[PDB]
Amino acid sequence: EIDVSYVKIEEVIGAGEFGEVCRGRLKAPGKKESCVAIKTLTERQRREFLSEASIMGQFEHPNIIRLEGVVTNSMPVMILTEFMENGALDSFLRLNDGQFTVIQLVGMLRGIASGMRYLAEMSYVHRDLAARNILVNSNLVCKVSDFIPIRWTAPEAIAFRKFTSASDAWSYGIVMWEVMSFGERPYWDMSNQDVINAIEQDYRLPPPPDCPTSLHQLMLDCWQKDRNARPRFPQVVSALDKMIRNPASLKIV
Numbered sequence: 001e002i003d004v005s006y007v008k009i010e011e012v013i014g015a016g017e018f019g020e021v022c023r024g025r026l027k028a029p030g031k032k033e034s035c036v037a038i039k040t041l042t043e044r045q046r047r048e049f050l051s052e053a054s055i056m057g058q059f060e061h062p063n064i065i066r067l068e069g070v071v072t073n074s075m076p077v078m079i080l081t082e083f084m085e086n087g088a089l090d091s092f093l094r095l096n097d098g099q100f101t102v103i104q105l106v107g108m109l110r111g112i113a114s115g116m117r118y119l120a121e122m123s124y125v126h127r128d129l130a131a132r133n134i135l136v137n138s139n140l141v142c143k144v145s146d147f148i149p150i151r152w153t154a155p156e157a158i159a160f161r162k163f164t165s166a167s168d169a170w171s172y173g174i175v176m177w178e179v180m181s182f183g184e185r186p187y188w189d190m191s192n193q194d195v196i197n198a199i200e201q202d203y204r205l206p207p208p209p210d211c212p213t214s215l216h217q218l219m220l221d222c223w224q225k226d227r228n229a230r231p232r233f234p235q236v237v238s239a240l241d242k243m244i245r246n247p248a249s250l251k252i253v
């Protein structure tokens with residue numbers, strides 16, 4: 001896939017499941033140099049590592065992390081993607097607590113919803129939609145990555161392992177809550193089991209401080225117990241676009 005001579009690993013920036021995550025530079029003949037994220041790396045686990053690239057490589061969308069390639073004929077085995085300068089959304093927001101406007105936050109949520117709209121249209125169920133799995137670039141563009149998280153997971157998917165695009169819509173509501181709360185943990189210190197019982201007993205997360213009521217209502221819609229009643233991702237995007245068109249709507253809190 002990618003000639004190893006074309007890759008320069010600069011800084012180690014994080015740690016992943018199978019190894020490091022690094023910032024680097026990719027320069028191939030005919031093409032300008034670009035900034036890349038690089039994951040570096042059991043046999044079964046090697047295919048486990050590389051599967052992420054194969055899935056990621058099925059997708060082409062501005063709100064889904066772009067795969068540049070892999071290094072496999074050489075060692076260490078690598079996966080290269082575009083570089084997202086601002087990292088994971090939950091930590092980026094915690095660092096920037098209170099510092100982005102409602103309209104900026106809605107833009108981030110819209111980018112995430114578009115990503116999910118695309119994946120649902122491709123019949124791809126994510127199963128692990130959470131702000132930690134959303135990456136942010138220098139322009140604040142949010143992209144879905146990562147190809148049972150109890151507090152993000154729909155009640156039926158927990159009970160039955162029924163993962164659908166409608167269970168993803170539940171998870172997206174949780175992401176909305178995370179974004180509007182600037183990266184607070186869903187259900188704070190409640191335990192997984194407490195969360196499981198709380199939801200079954202009709203508890204839902206309250207509006208975050210300063211959260212427009214219309215955004216909280218959209219969260220409640222995403223968290224309907226009847227999965228068929230939840231908005232599909234096209235309706236989610238359209239709702240968010242409506243709010244962007246009509247920012248007046250967002251002042252009610």
Ligand SMILES: COc1cc(Nc2nccc(Nc3c(Cl)ccc4c3OCO4)n2)cc(OC)c1OC
Nearest residue numbers: 013014037038039079081082083084085087088145
């Ligand atoms: C600046 O701080 C951080 C940046 C960052 N950026 C980033 N960008 C693209 C991908 C990625 N992780 C990744 C993923 Cl999620 C899937 C597959 C990959 C990956 O790298 C190549 O193969 N990271 C990421 C940071 O950590 C979240 C970060 O702070 C440490």
